[PDB]
């Protein structure tokens, strides 16, 4: 058979923090440090299908913070796509797993998930996750 009821999930790991206004965000974050964060993501969740994860893309954003005493806001992130993720609830043989994007993202990235409807500027925890469906009704298998 084929399971045609998997989804692709766009995932993003985020560290938002403030730095002295005289500094730059690329004194604090590197492509390499963010790629190492991607390497810590759990790649064998019960909800994971075949084909693993896309190439990770590090990003570094910087803006002066109007509300801060002379600080800049840094947003250091790494994003990748989980190609094939189960839909619904999944029983692994011993217990149930919720494969909805929120619980799945929190298990795989290990940080609190926020809907894309919530902007970075309105999020006040330092470390957090994004996850949203980028493709539905994909094969669970690599064939
Ligand atoms: Zn298939
Ligand atoms: Zn299949
Ligand atoms: Zn950091
Ligand atoms: Zn970072």
Query: What are phi and psi for residue 110, nearest 5 degrees?
Result: 80, 20
Query: What are phi and psi for residue 134, nearest 5 degrees?
Result: -105, -15
94 dihedral zone (left: phi>0; alpha: psi -120 to 50; beta): alpha
Q: Which helix (H) or strand (E) is 11 found in, with range?
A: strand 6-20
Ligand 3 midpoint to CA 12 (Å): 13
Other C-beta atoms within 10 Å of 117: how many?
Answer: 6
Q: Which two tokens stand for residue 127?
A: 């470390």
On whether residue 81 sits in a domain, the answer given is yes
Query: What are phi and psi for residue 15, nearest 5 degrees?
Result: -115, 110
On whether residue 55 sits in a domain, the answer given is yes
Residue 79: domain span:
6-138
Q: How many domains does the chain have?
A: 1
On whether residue 143 sits in a domain, the answer given is no
CA angle at 100 for the pair 97 and 106, rounded to the nearest 5°: 80
On whether residue 20 sits in a domain, the answer given is yes
The full 3-state SS of 67-116, as one line of letters, equals CCCCEEEEEEEEEEEEEEEECCEEECCCCEEECCHHHHHHHHHCCCECCC
Q: Looking at the CA of 13, which ligand is closest?
A: 4
Do residues 44 and 126 make contact, with C-beta atoms less than 8 angstroms apart? no
Helix %, strand %, coil % of the chain (to 5): 15, 40, 40
Ligand 3 midpoint to CA 130 (Å): 16
Q: What is the CATH number of the domain that holds 42?
A: 3.30.70
Ligand 2 midpoint to CA 23 (Å): 50
On whether residue 60 sits in a domain, the answer given is yes
Ligand 3 midpoint to CA 133 (Å): 26
Annotated binding site for Zn(2+): 15, 139, 143
On whether residue 59 sits in a domain, the answer given is yes
Solved how? X-ray
Do residues 42 and 19 make contact, with C-beta atoms less than 8 angstroms apart? no
On whether residue 29 sits in a domain, the answer given is yes
């Amino acid at each position: 058979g084929h399971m045609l009821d998997c989804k692709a999930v766009a995932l993003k790991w985020v560290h938002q923090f403030r730095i002295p206004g005289g500094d730059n965000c690329n004194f604090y974050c590197s492509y390499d440090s963010l790629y190492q964060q991607f390497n810590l993501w759990k790649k064998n969740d019960a909800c994971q299908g075949a084909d693993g994860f896309s190439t990770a893309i590090p990003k570094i954003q910087e803006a002066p913070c109007s509300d801060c005493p002379g600080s800049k806001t840094c947003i250091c992130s790494v994003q990748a796509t989980a190609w094939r993720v189960r839909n619904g609830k999944w029983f692994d043989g011993q217990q149930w797993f919720d494969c909805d994007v929120k619980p799945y993202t929190e298990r795989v990235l290990g940080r609190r998930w926020y809907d894309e409807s919530e902007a970075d500027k309105d999020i006040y925890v330092g470390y957090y996750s994004r996850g949203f469906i980028s493709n539905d009704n994909v094969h669970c298998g690599s064939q």
